């Protein structure tokens with residue numbers, strides 16, 4: 417797709433085969449969801465945002481699909497106010513910013 | 516330009532007569548700079564993200580030079596860890612995400 421930015425750029429995303437929504441966020445290094453339930457053990461991880469630093473759960477090698485693109489990546493789960501697709505995943509799907 | 520996302524997408528912009536670097540940020544509703552002097556009146560606002568909220572000054576109808584274009588729009592000013600160009604400004608230069 418080619419999408420403009422008048423509204424928040426949410427996409428449908430299948431993450432661990434569960435159907436969710438998340439914001440394509442070129443300012444996010446990492447991809448983070450609030451309450452998807454991914455199976456298994458996870459690694460503690462820290463992420464930083466406008467307000468400070470949060471402790472999140474890092475789940476490795478998680479399947480993610482966006483726009484027909486099926487990728488394997490790292491997905492954080494933590495108290496983010498909105499689900500975000502970060503640059504890690506966006507480079508895997510060949511996403512670019514254009515103007 | 517077509518910007519890939521293997522690194523953080525910084526651009527140089529002019530604001531308040533000064534050259535500043537800012538992150539092209541499709542997750543940011545509005546543009547925010549740290550430490551700039553703008554002349555008009557401002558209004559106090561708050562923005563939220565990862566780790567909580569940030570107090571900013573909202574200046575309305577401010578010029579920014581980004582790429583080759585004069586964009587007039589809202590600019591927020593506050594102690595953001597990184598300057599960001601948000602959707603409010605990117606929409607005015609017809610920026611799009613492509614994937």
Ligand SMILES: CC(C)CN(C[C@@H](O)[C@H](Cc1ccccc1)NC(=O)O[C@H]1CCOC1)S(=O)(=O)c1ccc(N)cc1
Nearest residue numbers: 550558559560561562569570571572573592593594595
């Ligand atoms: C640029 C904003 C962050 C300033 N604001 C918040 C204030 O905490 C602000 C925090 C701050 C100080 C210095 C640099 C950067 C930030 N301290 C402040 O300036 O005092 C200083 C000047 C000398 O002594 C103490 S604000 O404009 O006052 C305000 C208040 C409430 C809301 N909702 C919105 C804005």
Ligand SMILES: CC(C)CN(C[C@@H](O)[C@H](Cc1ccccc1)NC(=O)O[C@H]1CCOC1)S(=O)(=O)c1ccc(N)cc1
Nearest residue numbers: 443444445446465466542543544545562563564565596
């Ligand atoms: C969380 C999104 C929805 C909103 N933020 C934009 C995001 O791109 C934000 C940009 C940023 C980069 C580095 C340090 C600080 C902030 N990155 C971010 O948090 O990266 C996290 C999530 C995964 O990787 C790490 S914002 O900064 O809170 C924000 C809110 C409102 C306005 N007007 C402008 C900015």
Ligand SMILES: [Cl-]
Nearest residue numbers: 455456457458
């Ligand atoms: Cl256990």
Ligand SMILES: [Cl-]
Nearest residue numbers: 534535536598
């Ligand atoms: Cl700068």
